[PDB]
Paper text:
Crystals of the c11 ring were first grown at pH 5.3 and one of the crystals yielded a complete 2.2 Å dataset. In this crystal, one asymmetric unit contains two complete c-rings. The c-ring was crystallized in the presence of near-physiological concentrations of Na+ (100 mM). To confirm the location of the Na+-binding sites, we calculated an omit electron-density map. This map reveals 11 binding sites, each located at one of the interfaces between c-subunits. The most notable difference is the presence of a second glutamate side-chain, Glu32, in addition to the conserved Glu on the C-terminal helix (Glu65). Both side-chains contribute to Na+ coordination, via one oxygen atom of each carboxyl group. The other two oxygen atoms are at hydrogen-bonding distance of ∼2.7 Å from each other. This arrangement suggests that a proton is bound to the site in addition to Na+, consistent with the free-energy calculations described above. In addition to Glu32 and Glu65, Ser66:Oγ and Val63:O from the adjacent c-subunit also contribute to Na+ coordination. Ser66:Oγ and Tyr70:OH also interact with Glu65, as hydrogen-bond donors, stabilizing the so-called ion-locked conformation of the site.
Numbering used by the authors:
A (entry chain C), B (entry chain B), C (entry chain A), D (entry chain K), E (entry chain J), F (entry chain I), ...: 1 to 89
The structure:
């Protein structure tokens, strides 16, 4: 096998692998959506506690975001700093 | 392998990887939908807080939207600014 | 590889990528469906707030629709304005 | 590659892509089913108000239907108005 | 490529595409099931409203059924009225 | 291509398509299950409406069953009345 | 292609198809588990109706079981009474 | 092909098929967990009925378990009593 | 085909099949998580009955665990006691 | 087939199978999140039993974690203690 | 087979395996989102207990995060410390 063939296959698989990882993002979308809905509900109940309701929402949502970030990092690594290239040529 | 073959295979996988990434969009669709439903029953029960209800919904939905945007960005990168092309020829 | 083979593989992959992206549409379908049910519930209880309720339903649904649109756009690009074809030279 | 081979691969991929897109239809199925459920129990509680309940149900369901329609359109395009064929020759 | 090979691959991918589309059917199964559950709950609480409960159930379920029908039609087309066969030559 | 290869590939894909179609069955399983659960709590709470509850359950379940049947029909067609064979030789 | 090659491919695809069909079994698993949970809750609140509750649970579970059975039948057919073999010769 | 090749491909496909069938196990995992949850809540609130509650849970869980067993059987058949081998040699 | 090839393909497929089977473990993870939540809820309402509540939790979770175990066993069999090897050479 | 190839295919499949197994981890993520949520609202309503609530949360989460561990173990085996290499001669 | 071919195939599969593993991240996203939602509610209803509510949320979300971490570890291992390469040559 030549180098170009090697790079081609690995990068092609890397593109697919990056896309698969990004699927995980649906999770935070659902979870943070729930927290948003609970915040809306709580604000309706107590329009004056809105400031503390929103700060709590953001905090919990930020935590829920983390796995989405992990996937994005994996995808960006596969796209922009591919760790397989150095092992081929 | 010739350069055309390399571009072809890599871009083909990139198209598939792009599609896979976009699957994540279902999450925000569900999550923001829940927030939407919560807003609907809230403005019906607490009309005086309609302003704060809507603004909280939009903010909460925007956070939940983020992983959808991440995937879209990965997809647009794979289609329009493909990082693998420069690694071939 | 001739040009015909290159176009064939890229466009074939593009068709699959387009279909995969469109799967995301299930999300908004569920989320907006939830918002719809909450509107039905709310107008049954507060028929006087109907205008406010539907207005809020449509707004929240429109937001939840966005990732559905993103996928549609990615699909339409892959089908009608394929950005890979110009790099096959 | 000959032209018949080219078309065969592309149309074959297009049939798969069309099927993949149609998977999104499950979303509206779930979401609208939820709206139907809330309509049923609203009617049971306010039988006099069936007309208003139903019209709200229909409107909400119609919105939730859209991504199912997007996928159907994409599928019909790939089947009946395939945009890749003109690119092959 | 001869004609038989062309038809073989096209019809083969069509069978898979048909199967993939039919997966959407799970959605209406879940959604209409929910509507059925709410009707049961409703006839239990308001048995005198049994007539309007059922007619409401059927109507809402019929709407949620539509994407299941879309997939069925796409599958039937791929199986019995295949639109790719005339594009081969 | 000889007739045997043509049949082979088409039948093989058809077997895969049939299995894919059958995945939709999970939907009715979930949906009708929810209706059963609702019937259980209703029959306990309201023993007078027992016959109407079960009548409502069965009717709703039967409706929710349809997409399951659609898939079974597509599967049986692919297995026993394969429409692709008469297109070969 | 010789007959053994034909049988190998068709049966191999049949094995995969059978497994795919069996995935549907998760549906009844979820749905009947829900119906069981309601029976548990109902029995607790009114042991004075243990017989009626369980009888209704079984009936509703039996209905929800059906698509699971359809998949088993398809799998059993693909494994033990393969309808494709007689088509090959 | 030779016999060894025939057995190789079919048993290989059978291994994948077995794994796919086993995916259905998630269903009973979820459903029975729900029933387990309701039992915890029910036993706690109605200790005097712990016996009929637990037996109700077990019975309901056993029914929900069936599709998991169906998949296990199919998997064990593919692994230990493969019905395809006699068709190959 | 030599014996090494036969083993190679069969074991490779067995690896994929084993991974596929393990996917079902998400089910018990969800279901038992639910039972855990109901227990926490019940403990908070009746802390004196913690021992009894936990006892019920473990029982229900053990049952829900079963399909996860089935998948683990199938995977360990495919990895450590592969039943396909004796059919090759 | 040479030895290097045998190792290549088997280890390649093992990498894929390992990733597939890890998908199961989503289950414990959801279930333990639910347990976390019920605990959050429990310590709010019963700060007195805060100790018992946490200990119950952890214990329940630990049980629901098990299928996630099983998949990790299988993945680690496929990666670090691959049981197929010894069969390749 | 040469060593470059071997490394190419193994690393390509490893890229895909890594992406598949990262899909598990969706679980924590949903689960921690639920915990976040309950926290927003509880904080709004018991604003004096804000400290212990958030503390309970974080502890709960941390546990639910673990399987997400497991997948990230497997992926990072596959990308940066690939344990298959030392088996090839
Ligand atoms: C909770 C927060 C988690 C996110 C933070 C985690 C650490 C940071 C990860 C960022 C995601 C990866 O993003 C990617 O990183 C790699 C380095 O690894 C960079 O890659 C870099 O190294 C390559 C390889 O020599 C060079 O061509 C160049 O110097 C540069 O591109 C990419 O330019 C960047 O797009
Ligand atoms: C929409 C905003 C919210 C989502 C945020 C998404 C963040 C991810 C966006 C892209 C991150 C990576 O950003 C990417 O970094 C690499 C660095 O190697 C850049 O790459 C650039 O530098 C490298 C390194 O010398 C050069 O070899 C290359 O020719 C050049 O293009 C890309 O041009 C840039 O797009
Ligand atoms: C809320 C988030 C934002 C939502 C709204 C935006 C949704 C996303 C829409 C993106 C679709 C258009 O995306 C944009 O298309 C044009 C098409 O000429 C691309 O343009 C690219 O291709 C053309 C092809 O002729 C080249 O000449 C050009 O040099 C190149 O840059 C842009 O690089 C791309 O960014
Ligand atoms: C999910 C991931 C899937 C990854 C799939 C990767 C599939 C393709 C692997 C190709 O490896 C082949 O290896 C041969 C042995 O190294 C090469 O022989 C060479 O020597 C051969 C003849 O012995 C010659 O024809 C040439 O050098 C070339 O053809 C050939 O080029 C190379 O392509
Ligand atoms: C999920 C994502 C999966 C992505 C899978 C991508 C698979 C890509 C396979 C590419 O196949 C290679 O193409 C090379 C270039 O054509 C061939 O060169 C080799 O073979 C040619 C054809 O025999 C010879 O002409 C060359 O000299 C020789 O180096 C090589 O064999 C062949 O294997
Ligand atoms: C999820 C997305 C997956 C996308 C997968 C895309 C796979 C694309 C495979 C393309 O296959 C290559 O095409 C080249 C076209 O050139 C071939 O060159 C070969 O053509 C011949 C081999 O067929 C050589 O002998 C001749 O020299 C050469 O020109 C090469 O071998 C072949 O492998
Ligand atoms: C999800 C979908 C993912 C993508 C699926 C892609 C499937 C691609 C199949 C490609 O088949 C092509 O057939 C050509 C028939 O010509 C080959 O011609 C190549 O090899 C021939 C060898 O004889 C030469 O004659 C030709 O000139 C040369 O272009 C070409 O390599 C090969 O790739
Ligand atoms: C959803 C996934 C769908 C995947 C679909 C993949 C479809 C295409 C398979 C193509 O395989 C090639 O087809 C060529 C046409 O029948 C054959 O003729 C080729 O012979 C040469 C290649 O050897 C060509 O270059 C010459 O034009 C030709 O006559 C060639 O042997 C064969 O390998
Ligand atoms: C998901 C669906 C997947 C389907 C996958 C398999 C497709 C395989 C390729 C097509 O069948 C090939 O077809 C060629 C014909 O198209 C034949 O061509 C060969 O025989 C022909 C007879 O006309 C000659 O013309 C060709 O030149 C010669 O290459 C031969 O059977 C074989 O190479
Ligand atoms: C979802 C997947 C479903 C299952 C798909 C199974 C596909 C199996 C492979 C395709 O069948 C083709 O049959 C042709 C025969 O019909 C073979 O070539 C042969 O044709 C002749 C033999 O008949 C040779 O002598 C000539 O060179 C050649 O072109 C060709 O290689 C082979 O690939
Ligand atoms: C996708 C999920 C479902 C399962 C898919 C399983 C696909 C299994 C493909 C096995 O590949 C086939 O093996 C045959 C071994 O014989 C080859 O025979 C080739 O060689 C024989 C002997 O010369 C000829 O009779 C054949 O026509 C010729 O295709 C054939 O080409 C090749 O494709
Ligand atoms: C989820 C989908 C899982 C699919 C799993 C199975 C995948 C099998 C892929 C490989 O099939 C190949 O077909 C070749 C066709 O030639 C065989 O040729 C070998 O054995 C043949 C037996 O006829 C000989 O004719 C050939 O000359 C010799 O090279 C080869 O061994 C076999 O490996
Ligand atoms: C979950 C899915 C797993 C899919 C795994 C797919 C593995 C494909 C491996 C490569 O295909 C090769 O095809 C050759 C036929 O074309 C076979 O006969 C070959 O073995 C040698 C391969 O070169 C020949 O040279 C020797 O004569 C022969 O017996 C060989 O065994 C087989 O490996
Ligand atoms: C689901 C994921 C599946 C991932 C793995 C897919 C694995 C198989 C890729 C194709 O495999 C072939 O295996 C041959 C060994 O069987 C290699 O050498 C074979 O060919 C070489 C020459 O190219 C020499 O060893 C001799 O000619 C012949 O052994 C050949 O390069 C390689 O392409
Ligand atoms: Na997180
Ligand atoms: Na977000
Ligand atoms: Na949105
Ligand atoms: Na919509
Ligand atoms: Na509809
Ligand atoms: Na129906
Ligand atoms: Na049924
Ligand atoms: Na059952
Ligand atoms: Na069980
Ligand atoms: Na467990
Ligand atoms: Na965890």
């Amino acid at each position: 096998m030549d180098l170009l063939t090697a790079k081609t296959i690995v990068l092609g698989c890397s593109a697919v692998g990056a896309g698969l990882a990004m699927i995980a993002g649906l999770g935070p979308g659902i979870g943070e959506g729930y927290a948003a809905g609970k915040a809306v509900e709580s604000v309706a109940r107590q329009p004056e506690a809105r400031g503390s309701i929103i700060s709590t929402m953001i905090l919990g949502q930020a935590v829920a975001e983390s796995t989405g970030i992990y996937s994005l990092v994996i995808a960006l690594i596969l796209l922009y700093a591919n760790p397989f290239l150095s092992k081929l040529g």
